[PDB]
Amino acid sequence: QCDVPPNSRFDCAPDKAITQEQCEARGCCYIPAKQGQPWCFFPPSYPSYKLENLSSSEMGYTATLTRTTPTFFPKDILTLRLDVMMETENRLHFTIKDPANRRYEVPLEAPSPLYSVEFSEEPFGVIVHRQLDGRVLLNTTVAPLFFADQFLQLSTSLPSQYITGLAEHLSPLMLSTSWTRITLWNRDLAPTPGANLYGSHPFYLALEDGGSAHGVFLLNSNAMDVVLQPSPALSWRSTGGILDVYIFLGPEPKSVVQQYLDVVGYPFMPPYWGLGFHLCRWGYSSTAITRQVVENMTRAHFPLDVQWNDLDYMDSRRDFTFNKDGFRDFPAMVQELHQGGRRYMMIVDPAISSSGPAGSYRPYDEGLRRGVFITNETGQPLIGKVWPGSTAFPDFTNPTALAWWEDMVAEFHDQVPFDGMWIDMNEPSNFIRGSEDGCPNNELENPPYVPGVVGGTLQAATICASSHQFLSTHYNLHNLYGLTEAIASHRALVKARGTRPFVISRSTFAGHGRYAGHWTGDVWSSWEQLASSVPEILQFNLLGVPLVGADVCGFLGNTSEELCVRWTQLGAFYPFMRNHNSLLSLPQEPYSFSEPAQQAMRKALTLRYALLPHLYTLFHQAHVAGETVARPLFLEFPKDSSTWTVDHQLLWGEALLITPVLQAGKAEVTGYFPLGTWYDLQTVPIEEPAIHSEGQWVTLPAPLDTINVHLRAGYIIPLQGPGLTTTESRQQPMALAVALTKGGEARGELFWDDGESLEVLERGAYTQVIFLARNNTIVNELVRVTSEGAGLQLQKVTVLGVATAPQQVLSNGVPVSNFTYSPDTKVLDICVSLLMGEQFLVSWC
Numbered sequence: 060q061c062d063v064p065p066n067s068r069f070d071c072a073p074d075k076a077i078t079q080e081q082c083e084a085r086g087c088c089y090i091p092a093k094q095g096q097p098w099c100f101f102p103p104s105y106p107s108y109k110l111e112n113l114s115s116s117e118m119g120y121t122a123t124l125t126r127t128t129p130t131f132f133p134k135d136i137l138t139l140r141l142d143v144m145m146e147t148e149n150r151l152h153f154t155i156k157d158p159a160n161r162r163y164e165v166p167l168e169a170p171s172p173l174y175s176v177e178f179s180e181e182p183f184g185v186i187v188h189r190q191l192d193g194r195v196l197l198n199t200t201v202a203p204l205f206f207a208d209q210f211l212q213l214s215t216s217l218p219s220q221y222i223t224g225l226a227e228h229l230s231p232l233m234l235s236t237s238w239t240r241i242t243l244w245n246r247d248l249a250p251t252p253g254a255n256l257y258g259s260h261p262f263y264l265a266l267e268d269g270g271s272a273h274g275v276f277l278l279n280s281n282a283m284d285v286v287l288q289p290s291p292a293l294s295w296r297s298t299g300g301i302l303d304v305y306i307f308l309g310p311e312p313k314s315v316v317q318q319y320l321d322v323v324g325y326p327f328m329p330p331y332w333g334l335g336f337h338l339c340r341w342g343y344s345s346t347a348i349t350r351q352v353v354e355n356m357t358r359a360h361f362p363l364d365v366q367w368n369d370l371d372y373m374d375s376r377r378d379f380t381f382n383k384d385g386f387r388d389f390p391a392m393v394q395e396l397h398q399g400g401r402r403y404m405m406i407v408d409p410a411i412s413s414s415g416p417a418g419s420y421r422p423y424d425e426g427l428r429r430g431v432f433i434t435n436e437t438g439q440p441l442i443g444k445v446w447p448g449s450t451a452f453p454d455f456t457n458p459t460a461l462a463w464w465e466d467m468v469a470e471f472h473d474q475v476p477f478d479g480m481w482i483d484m485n486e487p488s489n490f491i492r493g494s495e496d497g498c499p500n501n502e503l504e505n506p507p508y509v510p511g512v513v514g515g516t517l518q519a520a521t522i523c524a525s526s527h528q529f530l531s532t533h534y535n536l537h538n539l540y541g542l543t544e545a546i547a548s549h550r551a552l553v554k555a556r557g558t559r560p561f562v563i564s565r566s567t568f569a570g571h572g573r574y575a576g577h578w579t580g581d582v583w584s585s586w587e588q589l590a591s592s593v594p595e596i597l598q599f600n601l602l603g604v605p606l607v608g609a610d611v612c613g614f615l616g617n618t619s620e621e622l623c624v625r626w627t628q629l630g631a632f633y634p635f636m637r638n639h640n641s642l643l644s645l646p647q648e649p650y651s652f653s654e655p656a657q658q659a660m661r662k663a664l665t666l667r668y669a670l671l672p673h674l675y676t677l678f679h680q681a682h683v684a685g686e687t688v689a690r691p692l693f694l695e696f697p698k699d700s701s702t703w704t705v706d707h708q709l710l711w712g713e714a715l716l717i718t719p720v721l722q723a724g725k726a727e728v729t730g731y732f733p734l735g736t737w738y739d740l741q742t743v744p745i746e747e748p749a750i751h752s753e754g755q756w757v758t759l760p761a762p763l764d765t766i767n768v769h770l771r772a773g774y775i776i777p778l779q780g781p782g783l784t785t786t787e788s789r790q791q792p793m794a795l796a797v798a799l800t801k802g803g804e805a806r807g808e809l810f811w812d813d814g815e816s817l818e819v820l821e822r823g824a825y826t827q828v829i830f831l832a833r834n835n836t837i838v839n840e841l842v843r844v845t846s847e848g849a850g851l852q853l854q855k856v857t858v859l860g861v862a863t864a865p866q867q868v869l870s871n872g873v874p875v876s877n878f879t880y881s882p883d884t885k886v887l888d889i890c891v892s893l894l895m896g897e898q899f900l901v902s903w904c
């Protein structure tokens with residue numbers, strides 16, 4: 060009866076240390092491990108729920124679940140309702156609820172399915188098979204179902220040892236199944252392994268032998284532990300709500316991601332300028348110093364689209380104010396930035412100063428009047444500590460607070476026309492535990508199961524769990540705080556400006572990408588953290604938050620010149636690129652380094668800017684099709700199992716492989732190359748030539764001034780001329796990099812719109828062009844042409860993989876004025892005068 064293999068034992072004492080006698084009293088098995096793995100575990104016969112009265116409807120299945128014997132947790136809900144909805148051929152959805160009481164739910168908006176579902180009667184379980192190969196994807200029969208008021212546990216076998224997701228944590232892309240506990244409870248803590256961080260995404264993608272995959276999303280916003288076992292298997296442990304589970308069938312990993320984003324929302328489309336270089340630090344104390352940054356960057360030929368300010372601008376570190384010493388002419392500074400073709404961003408915190416005299420600080424006075432703040436047991440606002448001192452916290456689930464936030468934003472924008480919002484401390488972060496007045500002693504503050512959060516209490520670094528919000532207690536809504544503020548800030552920026560919003564958030568939840576982007580927080584200026592940013596940037600793209608990046612050159616401590624060169628090189632490939640720096644630290648602006656470092660840094664930014672039309676096109680695909688912008692090799696080559704554990708290289712879209720140096724003092728790097736031809740992007744003119752891979756590791760030369768970037772054969776990349784801003788670069792002539800397959804084939808595309816407007820796709824206010832190389836010709840296909848795509852000038856076409864030197868080169872039937880061929884690199888470089896919107900034909904022989 061207790062003969063269960065070590066790796067398949069499920070913890071029967073997740074709540075406390077237990078003795079043999081007690082464990083056996085719980086009706087469990089006690090077998091110490093030989094060397095983590097639970098000593099107290101469930102026998103196959105342990106009491107669970109029983110499936111009764113299973114019935115079928117047009118929507119799917121319905122049943123009753125009954126538990127006869129109570130568990131060791133208080134408040135078992137002995138009678139449950141099961142609902143299974145077969146929503147599409149790719150998406151299966153099931154819920155387990157208490158049919159007698161509404162419980163907290165998260166607010167969110169051959170012809171056969173790829174899955175099949177079956178049920179185990181006793182103990183109850185849900186089994187999900189991939190139809191095509193009969194593989195078992197989900198099997199909840201492996202462990203008992205727990206459904207207590209403050210404890211939900213649902214377990215499943217996993218199809219392999221390869222699983223990714225469950226943000227936000229500092230870890231390899233592929234998670235460890237060796238008795239790993241992964242805690243989701245938003246928390247202000249500098250990124251360090253094994254710790255719950257700023258965001259929580261209860262979703263995972265599981266790979267299957269052969270390259271197929273599936274995803275599971277548990278729509279639950281409560282504090283939770285996700286436990287992984289080497290069998291392999293997984294256990295969801297939540298402290299509240301209900302079980303609301305979606306299964307996505309793929310079969311391709313990209314389709315799994317797309318299918319999940321169908322439920323939580325496709326990434327919002329950023330403004331083009333948002334994809335340029337952002338520069339910030341805590342410590343730009345005055346508008347004179349802030350203007351110097353732009354001056355010094357500009358002087359040194361370093362592009363910069365957006366200048367930022369941290370707390371410096373505010374009056375005594377309060378939102379929606381600016382001080383009259385260093386920032387007396389803040390409005391004029393921001394107006395000047397605009398005149399020059401640049402944008403402006405600044406930090407906003409959620410917490411509002413509550414200690415000023417009545418009537419002296421409108422945001423608080425108005426907020427108090429309209430009841431926008433989270434309240435305590437006695438109904439008064441909860442007061443904690445953040446930068447300005449005593450603070451009240453807005454409740455972004457309260458419609459009136461949404462309206463107040465819109466007003467405060469609009470009013471401040473009337474004074475200083477900022478172009479977006481950097482929203483920080485929105486876990487929400489608290490400098491003291493719970494509140495100035497502590498927290499009461501109840502079941503929400505002291506629950507029967509506390510997940511493995513840093514600090515051992517839900518109140519740590521945040522507000523009281525039993526505090527009141529409009530939709531529910533903070534206990535249920537905490538993981539949504541950041542998200543709700545992001546939603547509120549999204550709408551606020553739309554009303555204030557009338558163009559696409561640009562919101563960068565620290566705290567996030569699943570579905571965050573529909574409204575905002577993210578940066579990874581207070582990472583150290585270390586090689587370790589530079590390396591760790593690659594898996595985390597990829598993780599967030601898999602979770603539908605493509606607009607993500609880490610502070611370039613690091614936030615904490617002092618960076619080194621070498622590290623900042625390497626970080627800027629890799630950083631230029633973060634979909635969101637910002638260099639940010641702490642108050643105490645040494646300057647790390649591109650212009651504050653030696654000339655060789657500056658050159659290396661200038662080259663990185665130049666290449667990013669040249670690549671912007673492609674990057675933007677990738678974001679379009681993310682916005683319209685649930686694609687990822689930055690992706691791991693396995694998403695693109697799932698059937699090559701050697702890619703599965705690669706997370707220190709990244710792809711932009713399908714065709715651009717970036718292989719960064721991530722360690723000090725290296726002049727080479729070893730990267731995995733999937734089967735195919737990979738052309739070195741350094742052969743393309745910007746204002747070994749080819750790696751032929753069977754699917755193998757390749758050692759590449761990579762001196763300090765170099766980052767390896769390769770372009771996949773069979774792909775065409777749109778590029779554009781240089782500029783210190785996107786306002787400037789968007790007016791330049793464009794180019795194509797054409798990477799030919801051995802058979803002389805290639806495909807690519809360009810999306811172009813005004814770059815700022817709302818409802819572009821809905822109104823059809825965009826131009827979409829496809830490029831095709833075939834049989835020594837290059838043509839375009841006009842999928843859509845509008846006024847926005849007008850005047851787009853194509854002046855250069857670079858063809859890679861041209862074996863023999865051509866005797867003639869024609870553009871629309873006429874020999875081109877001049878071209879060059881290099882027999883050493885196989886590169887054909889052609890000068891033309893064409894329009895992306897006009898049908899053209901270029902040929903050679």
Ligand SMILES: C[C@H]1O[C@H](O[C@H]2[C@H](O)[C@@H](O)[C@@H](O[C@H]3[C@H](O)[C@@H](O)[C@@H](O)O[C@@H]3CO)O[C@@H]2CO)[C@H](O)[C@@H](O)[C@@H]1N[C@H]1C=C(CO)[C@@H](O)[C@H](O)[C@H]1O
Pocket residue numbers: 247249341369370406483484488580581614615639641
């Ligand atoms: C700026 C940053 O300050 C706060 O975090 C700091 C902690 O309060 C300090 O105690 C210290 O944390 C150390 C840990 O205690 C230690 O155990 C180890 O982990 O090393 C840590 C690093 O020294 O330093 C922390 C960072 O300086 C605050 O909690 C955090 O949220 C603040 N960061 C945000 C605030 C601003 C200012 O508006 C922005 O500049 C940042 O981008 C934000 O992320």
Ligand SMILES: *[C@@H]1O[C@H](CO)[C@@H](O[C@@H]2O[C@H](CO)[C@@H](O[C@@H]3O[C@H](CO)[C@@H](O)[C@H](O)[C@@H]3O)[C@H](O)[C@H]2NC(C)=O)[C@H](O)[C@H]1NC(C)=O
Pocket residue numbers: 103179181182186195198199200201
């Ligand atoms: C879903 O998970 C459950 C639990 O892991 C699996 O059911 C279990 O299957 C095992 C092995 O197939 C069963 O053990 C065997 O029982 C038979 C029947 O008496 C016996 O002839 C063998 O000697 C062996 O002991 C076990 O009874 C069964 N347990 C339960 C609770 O059902 C099931 O296989 C999984 N489903 C799928 C599709 O993988």
Ligand SMILES: *[C@@H]1O[C@H](CO)[C@@H](O[C@@H]2O[C@H](CO)[C@@H](O[C@@H]3O[C@H](CO)[C@@H](O)[C@H](O)[C@@H]3O)[C@H](O)[C@H]2NC(C)=O)[C@H](O)[C@H]1NC(C)=O
Pocket residue numbers: 435436437438439440441442496497
């Ligand atoms: C709910 O939140 C409110 C704040 O909105 C809390 O009110 C606070 O209550 C404490 C004492 O219960 C007050 O402390 C007192 O301060 C005065 C001086 O101002 C001092 O003379 C007293 O001896 C005492 O230290 C505190 O001032 C007050 N906060 C504010 C902003 O007025 C209330 O306690 C919270 N309720 C619960 C149950 O936590």
Ligand SMILES: *[C@@H]1O[C@H](CO[C@@H]2O[C@@H](C)[C@@H](O)[C@@H](O)[C@@H]2O)[C@@H](O[C@@H]2O[C@H](CO)[C@@H](O)[C@H](O)[C@H]2NC(C)=O)[C@H](O)[C@H]1NC(C)=O
Pocket residue numbers: 111112123125
């Ligand atoms: C499982 O269902 C049976 C039958 O339920 C009835 O038929 C259903 C389709 C629906 O119309 C229900 O409203 C009906 O009650 C349950 O057995 C019945 O229990 C009721 C209430 O105690 C009792 O009045 C009847 O005599 C029973 N009828 C029969 C045929 O046995 C049973 O209780 C359900 N089990 C669970 C665990 O919910």
Ligand SMILES: *[C@@H]1O[C@H](CO[C@@H]2O[C@@H](C)[C@@H](O)[C@@H](O)[C@@H]2O)[C@@H](O[C@@H]2O[C@H](CO)[C@@H](O)[C@H](O)[C@H]2NC(C)=O)[C@H](O)[C@H]1NC(C)=O
Pocket residue numbers: 616617643644645
């Ligand atoms: C980050 O560096 C600052 C400054 O470092 C000093 O100045 C540099 C130009 C360089 O020459 C360094 O070697 C210097 O130490 C550090 O702040 C200094 O801290 C030291 C010792 O703790 C103190 O005696 C100095 O007065 C400080 N100088 C200034 C200008 O503030 C800071 O501690 C470093 N941080 C880390 C995490 O290493």
Ligand SMILES: *[C@@H]1O[C@H](CO)[C@@H](O[C@@H]2O[C@H](CO)[C@@H](O)[C@H](O)[C@H]2NC(C)=O)[C@H](O)[C@H]1NC(C)=O
Pocket residue numbers: 348349351352355648
């Ligand atoms: C912008 O660049 C200027 C020019 O290098 C910097 O000005 C120098 O600052 C140092 C302090 O480290 C002084 O010792 C020099 O006298 C300054 N030179 C001049 C010509 O002013 C300035 O600090 C830079 N500003 C920023 C914000 O990076």
Ligand SMILES: [Cl-]
Pocket residue numbers: 077078079080
């Ligand atoms: Cl013992």
Ligand SMILES: [Cl-]
Pocket residue numbers: 162163530531532
């Ligand atoms: Cl509720």
Ligand SMILES: [Cl-]
Pocket residue numbers: 701
């Ligand atoms: Cl290998």
